[PDB]
Design a protein around this ligand. Structure first.
Ligand code: 5FA
Ligand code: ADE
Ligand code: CA
Length: 142
């Protein structure tokens, strides 16, 4: 298979982006494939040939959200509390372009959100680890 695991905890290694607008007032969220009313952020499994997390992160942001930007920060890691099953590596991305067409554009909705709506969405989705990643970002909370 094409899936990499932590040799310590055996958690699944995943990378994603907090995609922020230049003014940093909004963050890009996508609907989940499993729970279609739930809003999350682009992320996905690292595969064996990928040389770094940034690669996985930018791949998944393209694939899942049709977003292209530059990585402006490493937001560190966050684990899963449901040992852990998933170790996430997050980066902040400045959005340079949102393309109307992208691999998953038929199986996923996508929208910008202020800090406040995004926080509620992630509590509604029950993803505190993703909210922690969002809180480490330079998003404006006002
Ligand atoms: N708190 C949590 N921590 C870790 N994993 C959690 C989770 N809650 C659900 N999942 C589990 O992660 C997978 C993706 O669900 P998701 O986060 O809603 O993502 P998604 O369904 O939008 O994306 P998928 O197409 O399922 O892809 P994955 O994120 O599994 O990874 P992949 O892109 O490399 O296939 C599912 O099997 C789900 O049960
Ligand atoms: N990058 C980070 N990782 C873990 N805890 C943090 N608290 C603030 N920034 C953090
Ligand atoms: Ca995914």
């Amino acid at each position: 298979e094409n899936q990499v695991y932590s040799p310590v905890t055996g958690a699944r290694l995943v990378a994603g982006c907090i995609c922020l607008t230049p003014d940093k007032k909004q963050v890009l969220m996508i609907t989940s494939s499993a729970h279609k009313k739930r809003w999350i952020v682009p992320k996905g499994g690292v595969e064996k040939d990928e040389p770094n997390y940034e690669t996985t992160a930018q791949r998944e942001t393209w694939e899942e959200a049709g977003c292209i930007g530059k990585i402006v920060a490493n937001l560190g890691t966050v684990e899963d509390m449901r040992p852990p099953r998933t170790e996430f590596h997050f980066y902040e991305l400045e959005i340079e372009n949102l393309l109307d067409k992208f691999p998953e554009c038929h199986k996923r909705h996508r929208k910008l959100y202020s800090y406040t709506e995004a926080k509620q969405n992630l509590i509604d989705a029950k993803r505190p680890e993703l909210l922690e990643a969002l809180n480490r970002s330079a998003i404006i909370k006002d």
